[PDB]
């Protein structure tokens, strides 16, 4: 039976070294390639899934108030490079309601949301690196403005700067952060609003864009959304895709937020398996006679490496199937095929345009396709990993005796 061939191969050094080099090729194929890595696509698919979720619903998300979730009389805080209605900014300017659950999002939470969204979109735009890479950096810059009387979301206390008018604050807490504050006076030349306002610039240097760094930002994005859970109000295009519900709380998308949260959890553990593959390098060979019972100490590590690769591939498949729209029903399928896997731009990744709202713009379909393409091209590699798993395991047992 096939176990006759398994032992006949388990004691053939040529047949073992062939599998070991098969494991290096498939290991480097997984964690060093990008186009051709089911693992890569599945991390990318998790990230872009979160990113796209906010692009679809941010423009309709209610937010306002002053500094610590406090109601504001006349505050307008505008965050730039955000998917607003008809705009590349989002405008938090809701007054005389305290922010909270099933109400407007605090400016305190929108800052966490916004910063994670800016770091993601830049990182996506540069291009996520292969999972082997942990030393990639990205520089990130984003601005918001505050206008209206009594708006203190830009004060020296909110931003920490030496002085709101012209000040700057630099942080190096490991990665460098420079915040700078600039007042535009109501009667300044160029001031179109004829109203004083404050522009905050955030410049982040050395921000890591590794799989775990970025998968962690995606978790900050989706989790702030789900925990603040602000009230929302959709504006369906006439003759475009219809959304349901039209009003409610952002948590009300329990199906969608859960899908995204498990996709992030799965890709985090998927990324956690790369360290296993690295620590069980399979490239040294294994002129004399060779008997399994004595000189087969590589078997444990050869099995740990192959099994890591297999779990990484299965997890990759799981990430995709959590969102693959052919397998989805009802509203969740409506959400995904009508909005999340669409881009209403007129469009590199991480591009915010005036028409980005109410569409995912995260190449979600192309990544789902790129994930399938990758897996169908893993046919040989996948069999060889299990074949190497079978050999290494029969040698662990010969080694026990």
């Amino acid at each position, epitope marked *: 039976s096939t176990l006759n061939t398994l032992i006949k191969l388990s004691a053939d050094p040529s047949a073992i070294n062939a599998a070991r080099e098969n494991l290096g090729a498939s290991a480097k194929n997984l964690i060093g390639d990008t186009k051709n890595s089911p693992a890569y696509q599945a991390v990318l698919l998790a990230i872009n899934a979160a990113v796209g979720f906010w692009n679809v619903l941010g423009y309709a998300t209610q937010c306002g108030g002053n500094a610590n979730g406090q109601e504001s009389t006349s505050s307008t805080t505008i965050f730039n490079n955000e998917p607003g209605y008809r705009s590349t900014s989002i405008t938090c300017s809701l007054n005389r309601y305290k922010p909270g659950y099933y109400g407007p999002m605090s400016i305190e939470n929108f800052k966490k949301l916004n910063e994670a969204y800016q770091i993601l979109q830049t990182a996506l735009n540069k291009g996520l690196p292969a999972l082997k890479e942990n030393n990639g950096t990205v520089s990130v810059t984003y601005t918001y403005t505050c206008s209206g009387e009594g708006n203190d979301n830009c004060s020296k206390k909110a931003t920490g700067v030496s002085d709101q008018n012209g000040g700057t604050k630099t942080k190096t807490q490991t990665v460098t952060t420079t915040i700078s504050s600039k007042v535009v006076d109501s009667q300044a030349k160029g001031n179109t609003t004829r109203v004083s306002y404050t522009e905050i610039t955030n410049k982040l240097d050395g921000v890591p864009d590794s799989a775990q760094a970025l998968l962690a930002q995606a978790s900050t994005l989706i989790n702030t959304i789900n925990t603040a859970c602000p009230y929302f109000s959709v504006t369906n295009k006439s003759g475009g895709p219809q959304m349901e519900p039209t009003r409610g709380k952002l948590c009300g998308f329990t199906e969608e937020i859960s899908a995204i949260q498990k996709m992030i959890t799965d890709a985090q553990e998927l990324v956690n398996q790369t360290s296993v593959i690295n620590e069980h390098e399979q490239s040294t060979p294994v002129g004399k006679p060779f008997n399994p019972f004595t000189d087969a100490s590589f078997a444990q590590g050869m099995l740990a490496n192959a099994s890591a690769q297999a779990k990484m591939l299965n997890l990759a498949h799981q990430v995709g199937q959590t969102i693959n729209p052919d397998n989805l029903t009802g509203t969740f399928k409506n959400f995904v095929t009508g909005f999340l896997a669409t881009c209403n731009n007129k469009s590199p990744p991480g591009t915010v345009t005036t028409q980005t709202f109410a569409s995912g713009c995260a190449y979600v379909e192309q990544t789902i*396709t790129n994930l399938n393409n990758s*897996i169908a091209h*893993f046919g040989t590699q*996948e069999q060889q990993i299990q074949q190497a798993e079978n050999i290494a395991d029969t040698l662990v047992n010969f080694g026990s005796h």
Partner: nanobody
Framework: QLQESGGGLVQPGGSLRLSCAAS????????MGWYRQAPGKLREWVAA???????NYADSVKGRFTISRDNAKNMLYLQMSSLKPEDTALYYC????????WGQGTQVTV
């Protein structure tokens, strides 16, 4: 619940189509593929097909077989012509990456 059909004995240079009955549990939205089982050697990958319908094959098979699917009827199809001693095998289908327990197959030898 997975089984094949259409396997049989043919001379070298002949033809026959093989078919895989998979449930949507395996099929809907998943990539499908075909595999070999020769005596004395292991399961070898043959071909694959994307939900969207993209084909690709192995070198031992390059240029001869054609894999196809049916998204209405969860069916996999493989046409084999230009047969060789090397096609003597049990042919099986599975999703990619594989489900743990396999089907029973159908015997094609040349």
């Amino acid at each position: 619940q997975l089984q094949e059909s259409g396997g049989g004995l043919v001379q070298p240079g002949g033809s026959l189509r093989l078919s895989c009955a998979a449930s949507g549990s395996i099929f809907s939205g998943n990539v499908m593929g075909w595999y070999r089982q020769a005596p004395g050697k292991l399961r070898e990958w043959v071909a694959a097909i994307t939900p969207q319908g993209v084909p690709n094959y192995a070198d031992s098979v390059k240029g001869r077989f054609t894999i196809s699917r049916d998204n209405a009827k969860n069916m996999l199809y493989l046409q084999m012509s230009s047969l060789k001693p090397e096609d003597t095998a049990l042919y099986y289908c599975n999703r990619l990456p594989n489900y743990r327990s396999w089907g029973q197959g159908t015997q094609v030898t040349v």
